[PDB]
Amino acid sequence: WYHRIDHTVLLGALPLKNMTRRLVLDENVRGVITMNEEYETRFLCNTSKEWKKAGVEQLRLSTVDMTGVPTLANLHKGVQFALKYQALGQCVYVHCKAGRSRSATMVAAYLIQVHNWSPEEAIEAIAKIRSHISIRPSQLEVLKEFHKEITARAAKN
Numbered sequence: 001w002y003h004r005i006d007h008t009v010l011l012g013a014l015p016l017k018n019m020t021r022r023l024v025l026d027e028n029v030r031g032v033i034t035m036n037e038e039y040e041t042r043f044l045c046n047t048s049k050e051w052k053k054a055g056v057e058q059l060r061l062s063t064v065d066m067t068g069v070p071t072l073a074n075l076h077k078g079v080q081f082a083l084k085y086q087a088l089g090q091c092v093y094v095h096c097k098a099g100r101s102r103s104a105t106m107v108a109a110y111l112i113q114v115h116n117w118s119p120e121e122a123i124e125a126i127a128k129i130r131s132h133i134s135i136r137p138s139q140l141e142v143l144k145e146f147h148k149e150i151t152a153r154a155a156k157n
Contacts, residue, residue, distance in 0.1 A: 002099060003130040008086040011107045011130060012099040014045055020054050023093060030090035032058045033078050035070070035102050061106070068102050069142040072149065075109045082110050100132050105139045112143065113150050119143040 001019075002012020010027060023029040032051060037060055051058045059081045061074050070078065078094075085092045094110075096102040104126055111122035119140055127133040135143070 002093065002095075005107055005111070005126065005129065007089075008091055009082055009107055009110055010091060010093045011103055011126065012093065012095055014041065014095050014097055014099075015093060016044055017046055017050070020046060020050070024054050024056060027093070028089075028091045029093045030056050030088070031081060031085045031092035032056055033081060033092060033094045033103075033106060034058055034060045035094075035096040035106060036061075036063055038097075041097070063102055066138075067142070068136060068139045069105050072142065072145060075106070075142070075146050076149075078106050079110050079113050083114075098132075099130070101134050101136070101139070104130075104133045105135055105143065108135065108143055109146050112147055116150065116154065119147055 002010050004010050004027070010029065015023060015032065046054070048058045048060075059078065061070050061078055063070055069075070082092050094103050094106050104123075107126055108119060108122040111117055111125060112119060115122070117125075123133065123135050
């Protein structure tokens with residue numbers, strides 16, 4: 001249903017209400033990145049308040065319609081959110097629907113920034129762990145721009 005990517009990030013299909021307990025206690029999930037929350041499927045998942053109750057903060061992000069990826073700005077929001085919890089030694093569950101594409105792209109951006117890796121290095125790392133990762137050219141191009149921004153911010157240090 002989901003796979004651990006590293007000590008902080010997990011990537012998986014939409015989290016069912018019933019999984020909350022396991023995710024929080026066993027996987028130390030204290031944050032959740034929710035992409036493209038759809039009204040047709042939200043009865044299956046926690047609301048933002050049901051997450052609070054379990055002590056996890058939810059960050060909701062939208063993809064740029066038809067792109068499969070958020071804006072650069074929201075990619076940075078997602079990554080900084082993950083890093084927030086990395087500093088706390090806690091975990092973040094990253095999802096959209098199937099945990100294969102839009103959510104995979106978000107995790108890719110995280111890995112790019114964390115490791116100063118190429119988009120393809122990050123993607124291949126994710127695919128080595130979780131099957132059916134599918135990051136399309138439209139999604140890869142944004143990860144390419146994200147990679148350039150990460151490098152330029154790194155040169156400022």
